[PDB]
Design a protein around this ligand. Structure first.
Ligand code: FES
Ligand SMILES: [K+]
Ligand SMILES: [K+]
Ligand SMILES: [K+]
Ligand SMILES: [K+]
Ligand SMILES: [K+]
Ligand SMILES: [K+]
Ligand SMILES: [K+]
Ligand SMILES: [K+]
Ligand SMILES: [Mg+2]
Ligand SMILES: [Mg+2]
Ligand SMILES: [Mg+2]
Ligand SMILES: [Mg+2]
Ligand SMILES: [Mg+2]
Ligand SMILES: [Mg+2]
Ligand SMILES: [Mg+2]
Ligand SMILES: [Mg+2]
Ligand SMILES: [Mg+2]
Ligand SMILES: [Mg+2]
Ligand SMILES: [Mg+2]
Ligand SMILES: [Mg+2]
Ligand SMILES: [Mg+2]
Ligand SMILES: [Mg+2]
Ligand SMILES: [Mg+2]
Ligand SMILES: [Mg+2]
Ligand SMILES: [Mg+2]
Ligand SMILES: [Mg+2]
Ligand SMILES: [Mg+2]
Lengths: 65, 113, 72, 170, 50, 108
RNA sequence: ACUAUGCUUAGCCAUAAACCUAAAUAAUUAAUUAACAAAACUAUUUGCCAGAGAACUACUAGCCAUAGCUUAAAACUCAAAGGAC
RNA sequence: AAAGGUUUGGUCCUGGCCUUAUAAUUAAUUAGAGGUAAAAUUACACAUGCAAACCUCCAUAGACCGGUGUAAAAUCCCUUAAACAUUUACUUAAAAUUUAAGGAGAGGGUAUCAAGCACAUUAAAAUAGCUUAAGACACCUUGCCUAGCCACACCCCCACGGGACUCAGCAGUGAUAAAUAUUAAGCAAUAAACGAAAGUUUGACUAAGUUAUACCUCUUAGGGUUGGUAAAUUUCGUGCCAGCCACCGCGGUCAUACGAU
């Protein structure tokens, strides 16, 4: 926050990685970590289906043209 | 060249995040009077701002300009200026680099580098 | 400084400990069933998510973890 | 005992003593001050005593204060045109700071009085209505006018009950 | 009137900038003298320590 | 508490006013079910005249009958009011003398 | 008289009147005796408290804990409970 | 709050409860007359009558007024744009009234509701983000902003459709509730609708009827209380019984505390 140039050199030379403090604390327990894993997986599946649909829709339009 | 509808035509805040593409999450704070205590406290608001050049870093004070048309649901401002860069502040009064309450370059000197 | 307030708590805890000892076997069966209902509620809440999202089957290679059973 | 130091700052009379009413151009006032030092004592007193008074009279102006970021304290105003007015408040008393900003970016007494009169243009003393908006609810209250029948009974000949009886009698 | 007041403000900032350089100049002279004396003590102590 | 703590919490939370035997109503009408005697908790000694009633709400409560002598019987209708009988624990209702089947005390 | 156990090595458990029954920090000792204890008192920040019992309880959630710990009510009863002398 | 009563053998501290003030609804007992204001159990089911017309045909109005508090944390305040199912002007502008997208700040309860689970950005379509202990999300409760505003209009949030098929317009009824206004008169005044107009219409409204719920002026007198807090008891009866108290308490034979006087 004061001397960024010295900060960059110090971290590079000393080999220290600096991670910024996260804005919000995340609670962790078996029920949360298991629901959060499904929620991420469900989203990914929904988005994968949309991408496939777009490719098929575009492919059909290209053939018509 | 009509201006925005939003009340915050000009807002100052701190860049609390920069993980979205070309967008910087900025936390502005205003003073609100507690009616019971008659004392002012800090009410903070989050503003998404269009950072076209991705020139923003977490912790730097910035000035946002209200966009004439909202770019998206939440992006209704753009990055006008970076008032203070994080760790790279330049004293407005003298114009010399500073690192806290100290001069990295003396104001007596004229480096012109 | 008397210990009278400590003696009231002393008797409550003594009597409560003897009540738990009498009905220890009953309490065990209540818990195993409360955990089973706790697991079903967890599974149903996970099924609600993917069904609302529009999926007709749970994500591929997903099996709801059994988190309340005697896994440890 | 009211808590805190200088509890008078938390009274409506003190907050109303502020005299700096910014022009419509002023939108933001950033305050850069140092918590330790000798040349920034007036700036620290300005944040302690004056910033509450300024905010009270300028509720729509964003006052954001930054601490120990620069060697010297200063004030920077952001205007709606895009202009930035930098003020240097080092070695300046808190009272001097208030007077400086009042001159450069403060509305004049003439302007403020004109706005006050315009606000009350639609209140008329003659208007009748509820107490919240008017002096008198009814003309019965006025002296010389016929009084309210509730307070003073009307003459029999001025009553519909009596007139109806005569019309039947006729 | 706005332009005149914004010109007066810039004049006040320059006037105070001049005082700041005058004050800091005096400090450099005094602090330089102290620095030379402090370096002398280090030279004396450093030689003795060696 | 500090001024910051008073601000973050605000005014004291106020527990809701739970209702009593009349359920926030001036009176209720009930049908007598049984007439019995209740004994006042010591140090008092008496045979206090009470009755069970089914209130219009549908619940059943115990009501003290004031006065020297009542003619109440089962299936009668009465108008109950609030007010606890201090010696009788749990008796939070009273019968109104002079309404419906219950009548004014016979003066001696 | 003799076990579990107190010991070692691995892991769990997470509770004490874990109490100086004194949160931390920086001031002041006079323009200051509720009592007793440990003289009084200001400022700053966070935590906590809001009659007693029901209650180190019921339910909820987390936990290697399964006769467990932490979190923690209400109905109802009472006109007191409690501290010091 | 100008406070008071009540922990003890006693004092002090702490602390709850209650008392004294004010107002509304209902009930007991009791009351003459007049003027005024307000009328109120119930989004329960509704018998009958009425509540919208006007007018040379076209149109306009029946979108208002009046009613209820259904739903909803629902909102307040403010900004922008746009029309208007309009009015009054011009061939181009002043209003009234709305709608849409928003946000300086403010805005009920429960944190034993602590995570929500797509809630983000970019614009080669990639990046993996968004909200949240400064309270998200979930649930519960509630009309609020009061010259008035908002939502609802038999029910299914909606109303193509379907259904258990309409007084939450005036008066009135059934049921239910501690809760009890006339199945009334007139469009003369004001307001609205229509008409170029004389005019017509209106359970809006006006003038009445009803009711100690309130106020006002008069006339009669009733109601409660009488141990302390807290203004005020004579005699007898009763004898821990019968009874009484907001709190403390009273009653076992001289009861200022019960009942009658
Ligand atoms: S209020 Fe004026 S006549 Fe009654
Ligand atoms: K007694
Ligand atoms: K100890
Ligand atoms: K007290
Ligand atoms: K509806
Ligand atoms: K008329
Ligand atoms: K006697
Ligand atoms: K008596
Ligand atoms: K008497
Ligand atoms: Mg016990
Ligand atoms: Mg052994
Ligand atoms: Mg502990
Ligand atoms: Mg120890
Ligand atoms: Mg324990
Ligand atoms: Mg437990
Ligand atoms: Mg438990
Ligand atoms: Mg009545
Ligand atoms: Mg209306
Ligand atoms: Mg409702
Ligand atoms: Mg619970
Ligand atoms: Mg409907
Ligand atoms: Mg109906
Ligand atoms: Mg209808
Ligand atoms: Mg009706
Ligand atoms: Mg009534
Ligand atoms: Mg006309
Ligand atoms: Mg009596
Ligand atoms: Mg008495």
């Amino acid at each position: 926050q004061t001397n960024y140039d010295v900060f960059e050199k110090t971290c590079k030379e000393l080999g220290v990685e600096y991670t910024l403090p996260p804005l919000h604390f995340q609670k962790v327990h078996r029920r949360f970590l298991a629901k959060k894993a499904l929620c991420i997986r469900v989203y990914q599946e929904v988005q994968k289906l949309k991408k496939q649909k777009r490719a098929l829709k575009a492919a059909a339009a290209a053939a018509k043209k | 060249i009509v201006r925005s509808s939003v009340h915050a035509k000009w807002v100052v805040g701190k860049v609390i995040g920069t993980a979205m593409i070309k967008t910087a999450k900025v936390r502005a704070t205003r003073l609100v009077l507690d009616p019971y205590l008659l004392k002012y406290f800090n009410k903070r608001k989050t503003y998404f701002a269009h950072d076209a050049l991705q020139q923003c870093s977490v912790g730097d004070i910035v000035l946002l300009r209200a966009l004439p048309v909202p770019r998206s649901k939440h992006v209704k401002h753009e990055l006008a200026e970076i008032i203070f860069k994080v760790g790279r502040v330049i004293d407005p009064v003298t114009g010399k680099p500073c690192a806290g309450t100290a001069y990295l370059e003396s104001p007596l000197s004229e480096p012109r580098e | 400084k008397n210990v009278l307030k400590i003696r009231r708590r002393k008797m409550n805890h003594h009597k409560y400990r003897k009540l738990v000892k009498r009905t220890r076997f009953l309490r065990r069966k209540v818990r195993e069933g409360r955990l089973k209902k706790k697991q079903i509620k967890f599974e149903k809440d996970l099924k609600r998510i993917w069904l609302k999202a529009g999926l007709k089957e749970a994500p591929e290679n997903w099996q709801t973890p059994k988190i309340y059973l005697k896994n440890k | 005992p009211m808590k805190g130091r200088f509890p008078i700052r938390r009274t409506l009379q003190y907050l109303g003593r502020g005299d700096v009413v910014f022009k419509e151009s002023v939108k933001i006032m950033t305050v850069n001050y140092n918590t330790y030092g000798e040349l920034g004592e007036g700036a620290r007193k300005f944040v302690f005593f004056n910033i509450p008074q300024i905010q009270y009279k300028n509720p729509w102006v964003q006052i954001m204060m930054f601490k120990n970021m620069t060697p010297s304290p200063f004030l920077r105003f952001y205007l709606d045109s895009g202009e930035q007015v930098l003020v240097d408040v080092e070695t300046k008393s808190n009272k001097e700071i208030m007077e400086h900003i009042k001159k450069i970016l403060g509305k004049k007494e003439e302007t403020l009085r004109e706005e006050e009169l315009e606000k009350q243009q639609r209140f008329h003393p003659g208007n009748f209505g509820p107490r919240k908006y008017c002096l008198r609810e009814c003309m019965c209250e006025v002296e010389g006018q016929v009084p309210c029948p509730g307070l003073v009974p009307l003459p029999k000949e001025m009553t519909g009950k009596y007139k109806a009886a005569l019309k039947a009698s006729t | 009137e706005h332009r005149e007041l914004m010109a007066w403000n810039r004049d006040e900032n320059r006037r105070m900038q001049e005082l700041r350089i005058a004050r800091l100049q005096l400090e450099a002279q005094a602090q330089e003298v102290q620095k030379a004396e402090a370096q002398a003590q280090r030279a004396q102590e450093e030689q003795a320590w060696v | 508490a500090t001024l910051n703590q008073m601000h973050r919490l605000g005014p004291r939370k106020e527990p809701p006013k739970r209702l009593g035997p009349t359920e926030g109503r001036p009176q209720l009408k009930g049908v007598v079910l049984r007439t019995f005697i209740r004994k006042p908790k010591k140090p008092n000694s008496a045979n206090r005249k009470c009755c069970r009633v089914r209130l219009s709400t549908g619940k059943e409560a115990v009501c003290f009958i004031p006065g020297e002598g009542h003619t109440l019987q089962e299936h009668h209708v009465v108008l109950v009011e609030g007010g606890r009988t201090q010696d009788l624990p749990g008796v939070k209702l009273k019968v109104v003398r002079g309404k419906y089947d219950c009548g004014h005390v016979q003066k001696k």
